[PDB]
Amino acid sequence: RTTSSFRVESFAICVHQLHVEKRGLTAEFVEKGDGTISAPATRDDWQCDVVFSLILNTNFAQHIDQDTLVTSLPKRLARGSAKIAIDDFKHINSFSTLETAIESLPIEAGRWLSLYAQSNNNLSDLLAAMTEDHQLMASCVGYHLLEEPKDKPNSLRGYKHAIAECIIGLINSITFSSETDPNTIFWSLKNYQNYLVVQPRSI
RNA sequence: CUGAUAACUUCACGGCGGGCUUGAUGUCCGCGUCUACCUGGUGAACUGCCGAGUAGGUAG
Questions:
Q1: Please, are residues A116 and A129 in contact by the beta-carbon 8 Å criterion?
Q2: Whole-number Å distance, CA A96 to C1' B35?
Q3: A73 touches strand B (CB under 7 A)
Q4: Is strand B less than 7 A from the beta carbon of A24?
Q5: Core vs surface per residue A50-65: b (16+ CB within 10 A) or e
Q6: What is the DSSP letter of A161?
Q7: Measured in angstroms, what separates residue A17's CA from nucleotide B42's C1'?
Q8: E strand or H helix at A171, and its extent?
Q9: Which sign does the torsion angle of CA A142, A145, A150, A155 carry?
């Protein structure tokens, strides 16, 4: 919206805290359909608490700002909130060498993330790898189309609408000691013509 | 341009009653520590005088 050549091109995730539990999401009153105003149906949820930090390898070989690099932050991550601090606005900096860039993180108790490139043809493949480690996570890394896709009338932002599935994957721990190349970090989106899987740029 | 957009789980509460861990016991025998060692103040802060004085004062 200010300089239209940003081109972020990748990102890198560093999970410092993780906490999952059941909390319950109270939905609010709707017009039911017979004559009354009550709440909709009840479910259970699962809510999380992520303290993380990001490395971004863009192409913009120039300083950004100090002020509008705060005003341009979004405020949500998977239905959540996204705040930092007042006094952590002095650790936001840009660099041109990614080995001094992991020195700028003022916490030093984290973990990095990659993808586990071993075959997982059923559920029994994962749990065997999940009982040798008990430190690996699974999530949805991409989608999987059922359609070419097609132009449907009330599609959201009017673009082109398909119908997708979810792609399970496996998430790993990395220390980045002195030798792990960054291609196992810095993930992207590659568009393999029927599935939009996010994987790092080493594969 | 995020399984997208919005979202109050709340009110009340007496864990209680009673209680014998006991009896018995041999840690002992032997034993070589030793040899050899430089701490270095030149002359340097000297001589009277009063007072009975190992006290006290006083001169250049």
A1: yes
A2: 71
A3: no
A4: yes
A5: eeebebeeeeeeeebe
A6: B
A7: 80
A8: strand A164-171
A9: negative
Beta strands in A44-149 (DSSP E): 47-48, 51-55, 137-145
| Per-residue exposure over A139-167, b if at least 16 CB sit within 10 Å of its own CB, e if not | eebbbeeeeeeeeeeeeeeeeeebeeeeb
Does the CB of A39 sit below 7 A from strand B?
A: no
The CA distance from A71 to A68, in Å, is 5
Residue for token pair 């008990």: A134
Check: CB of residue A12 under 8 Å from CB of residue A187: yes
Breaks, C-N > 2.5 A, in chain A lie after none
Tokens of A16: 């410092």
Match 């017009």 to its residue by tokens: A31
Query: CA–C1' distance A85–B57 (Å)?
Result: 82
Give distance CA A105 / C1' B30 (Å). 70
Resolution of the experimental model, in Å, one decimal: 3.2
Instruction: Please tell me the distance from the alpha carbon of residue A55 to that of residue A104, in angstroms, as a whole number.
Output: 10
Distance, in Å, from the CA atom of A181 to the CA atom of A91, rounded to the nearest integer, reads: 25
Please indicate the experimental technique that yielded this structure.
cryo-EM
